[PDB]
């Protein structure tokens, strides 16, 4: 998606992709609408 936006093939991109420093430098991001981040899922061990 980032390459597609940079190559100007697609003027808009919405694919539930996150925002990063390496990403915001090449393409522009609007205000985020869903809260997310880095999380860890673990089993149900007691």
């Amino acid at each position: 998606m980032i390459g597609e936006v940079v190559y100007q093939r697609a003027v808009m991109a919405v694919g539930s992709l996150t925002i990063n420093e390496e990403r915001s430098e090449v393409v522009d991001f609007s205000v985020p609408f869903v809260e997310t981040g880095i999380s860890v899922m673990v089993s149900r061990s007691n």
Partner: protein, 45 residues
Amino acid sequence: GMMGELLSGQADMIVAPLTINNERAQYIEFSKPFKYQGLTILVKK
């Protein structure tokens, strides 16, 4: 208030717990939020 002071030219930049609002965003620009939080209620238990 703070928004009026910023628009009046007295203030150049605002760093404060300023909730992002559409009406505020119409005349002001908000950077990427540093934290995410909503609204709740406070009550004595």
